[PDB]
Amino acid sequence: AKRTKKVGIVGKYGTRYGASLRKMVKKIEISQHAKYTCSFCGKTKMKRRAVGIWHCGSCMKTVAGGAWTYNTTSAVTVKSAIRRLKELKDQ
Amino acid sequence: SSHKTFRIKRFLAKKQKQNRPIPQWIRMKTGNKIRYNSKRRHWRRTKLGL
Amino acid sequence: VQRLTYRRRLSYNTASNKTRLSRTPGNRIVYLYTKKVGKAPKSACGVCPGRLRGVRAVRPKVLMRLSKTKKHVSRAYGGSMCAKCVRDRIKRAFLIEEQKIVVKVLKAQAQSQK
Amino acid sequence: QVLKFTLDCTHPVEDGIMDAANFEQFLQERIKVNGKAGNLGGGVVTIERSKSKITVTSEVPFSKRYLKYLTKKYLKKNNLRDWLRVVANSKESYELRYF
Amino acid sequence: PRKIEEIKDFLLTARRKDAKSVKIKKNKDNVKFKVRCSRYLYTLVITDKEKAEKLKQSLPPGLAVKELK
RNA sequence: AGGGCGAAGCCAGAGGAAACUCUGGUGGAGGUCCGUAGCGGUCCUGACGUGCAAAUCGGUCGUCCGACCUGGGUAUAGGGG
RNA sequence: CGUUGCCCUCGGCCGAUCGAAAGGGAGUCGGGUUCAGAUCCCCGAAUCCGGAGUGGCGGAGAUGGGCGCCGCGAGGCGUCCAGUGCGGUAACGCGACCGAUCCCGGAGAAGCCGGCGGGAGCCCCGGGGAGAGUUCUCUUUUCUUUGUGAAGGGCAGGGCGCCCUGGAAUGGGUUCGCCCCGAGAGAGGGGCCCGUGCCUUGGAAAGCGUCGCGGUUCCGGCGGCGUCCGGUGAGCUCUCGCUGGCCCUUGAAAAUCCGGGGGAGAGGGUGUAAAUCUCGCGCCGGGCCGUACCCAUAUCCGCAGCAGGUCUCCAAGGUGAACAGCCUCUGGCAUGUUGGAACAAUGUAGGUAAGGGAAGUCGGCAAGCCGGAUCCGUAACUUCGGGAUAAGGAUUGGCUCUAAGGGCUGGGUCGGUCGCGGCCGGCGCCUAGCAGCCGACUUAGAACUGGUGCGGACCAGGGGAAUCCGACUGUUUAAUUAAAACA
């Protein structure tokens, strides 16, 4: 809290849009601009390019992910289920 | 305009030829009722078939 | 100061109407119109973002004029594809075929066993 | 180096309009060196007399057209800038002439 | 245009069918030899004066040799 | 045009047992502020009101990186757009 | 060998066609020339595209190696094979280097915004010249002017997400910001791209500046001299480049052009061939239409030479934050459809007013106050971001000084030997650096000074407390309603 007590990323917006909305945006607004780790090389370069598409700059691995996160929870839970059923079918 | 079609350029040419005033020997013809051209078009007032 | 005019009937400053200043032997600054900037070809691999070496990056309808040597490079996949992606293609294509052979061998042993 | 600038005034003197000795004297007075008017900055520049032709001979860096200035100044003082005109005859030289 | 570096080479270029005027510019300290052809205006810089005077004679059948002033 | 404010990220220093916090920088966000061209058109209920003008003029004003301004091309036609 | 007829063989497309004088789209520039046209005429330098058959010529393909003889030897013949180019560890290179249908790829072909860097044009400064103006006094003066097209070749200067060596924690490298590294950092060596910058061919012959002649004339006449050297930068304009930021916005197609994978074919048989996405040269051609001028306080539209409207490019000095205003050069005008003489009332547009200070009026409408900068100082309230230039204060000129901020280059001196310079060996090793040489510009402080004047013109917020409405930015009745209406 060097410059701001409690706005951070959403200090750009100034007074506008209301407190709740700006608090609500701060979560996403952070995550979406986060640089994640490319589970492919392991550098911290997974960066959202456009909605649902994240690109490693080093790996050059474009990756269909979430709108504001490299992974949605939904996607993750769906992944594991499919893996479980796959194993249940084939044996 | 300085970017003319050929169609338009030719049109202008004829218009430019039509402007000239009567030849004065016409006045001396036998059954002459014509004293002046009366179809004379000045560019600054009256602005073409366009 | 010598101000100046465009030399063509294109008034608007556009992609087509780009210029540069030049002093003539007559000692008057004059506009010369400039040719667009050509790009080197990018790789056929499609991951390597960097454009290709040893090729004259020039506006494509020029290539016509150019000699063959300018337009490419002495390698397999020359001036179409970056080296790195060739020497990975090479050893990939080799190593793959060695495993295909190994699976063929494991298949043939399984037939002889059964 | 040796910077040798003539300043010949042939046919204003032959017509008797000015005197070259007085012009020399005026030049020895004025010709400034390093922002000092008198004494030619010591024994640095040297002014010569040959009836009509003046020669200025410097060792230090010395502009040519400073002689044009001072002739123009001298000609104004004598009310000659009207029918007398300084010109570069050649390099290392000026030349007083009529119109 | 094209500069040339060998006195022989300019002599060969001058000896072509397409060639014509072989004008000669004494610049002082230089003495060029400009020989026009179909496509290009070949020039050759010959720093020596006596060597230029010698070459002057060595142009062949009755070309223009239109010396420049 | 040119200025202002100075958001995230980054550096150092100091404290803190940790959590982390302070101080100084850097950084340059924004349907952010001033303010030109631009776009507009508040008030003077000013000028004009057989006008310069069948809606103009002057000062004063709003906005000026964005639901911005704007040329050309192209689409939608009358109980229709 | 062409040309055609027939037979077989192969062939996806994708919609005929139209649609841009600003999108895409090969290739032209310098000088001259007119009463009026010039990238179009003339001179000179280029260039693309198409053709080029019989192939016009060189060069490449390609002229090796073997064995057998004969010859002192250089070599000559006989006969056997090879020959669709070579260099580099590599990035990749070299003037050419066969090849079809088919396939893959690229180029054409990409938003806005910020920051930083390089290159030019212009500005600036210090000097050289040539011509000027000033000269009562002063002024080594102030003013002008001081050049090199495209296309080639060279070389700086940029950039590289290219390669090789090698192996980095005491982690390093490094940007204004970042950002990069065992998926290979630093360090060394290279490779490629752009090269609009220099040099050079062009090209001094041409241009410009000066002095000077030839000619009653006509005359594009002819000569001299010159066209120099340096330095600066949050400078501005354009541009090339790198690197970030923003998006529930992700920012054109196609014609055209190339590369690669393939390997169906073709070539001649030991001096030659087919082959040149041909290398260098040579020859021939490029039709059609537009091209005057105005482009706007007089060539356009508003009935007009109408204060209206109407899309762009270029863009000097001073002051200054500044494309603000004010004054200036370059260039341009004659005050906007008239003149003269008066200076009454009413006006329109500006100003100023003693004492009071909104008593005026529906209402502070109108005008006035405030205004820049630096330094302090900053409330309630709050969505904690703001409010905020809150408010409220002080300073500001001229002059003469001081202090503080940067770059470049330099020691390998002693001894030896070789030609002030090199090479070797030994000291030295400024390793707290010191010395000389350059150059913008700011900031702070101090003295003195003036009739307290100083952001001296220009530019340039009046504040405060509360209530009502609408969250906000946005939009709206062209021509009486900008709002609380719509969004």
Ligand SMILES: [Mg+2]
């Ligand atoms: Mg009209």
Ligand SMILES: [Mg+2]
């Ligand atoms: Mg175009």
Ligand SMILES: [Mg+2]
């Ligand atoms: Mg190459």
Ligand SMILES: [Mg+2]
């Ligand atoms: Mg009114």
Ligand SMILES: [Mg+2]
């Ligand atoms: Mg009236």
Ligand SMILES: [Mg+2]
């Ligand atoms: Mg009027």
Ligand SMILES: [Mg+2]
């Ligand atoms: Mg069409």
Ligand SMILES: [Mg+2]
């Ligand atoms: Mg390295």
Ligand SMILES: [Mg+2]
């Ligand atoms: Mg014209």
Ligand SMILES: [Mg+2]
């Ligand atoms: Mg104009």
Ligand SMILES: [Mg+2]
């Ligand atoms: Mg007037």
Ligand SMILES: [Mg+2]
């Ligand atoms: Mg008048």
Ligand SMILES: [Mg+2]
């Ligand atoms: Mg008028």
Ligand SMILES: [Mg+2]
């Ligand atoms: Mg009063």
Ligand SMILES: [Mg+2]
């Ligand atoms: Mg009353």
Ligand SMILES: [Mg+2]
């Ligand atoms: Mg009252």
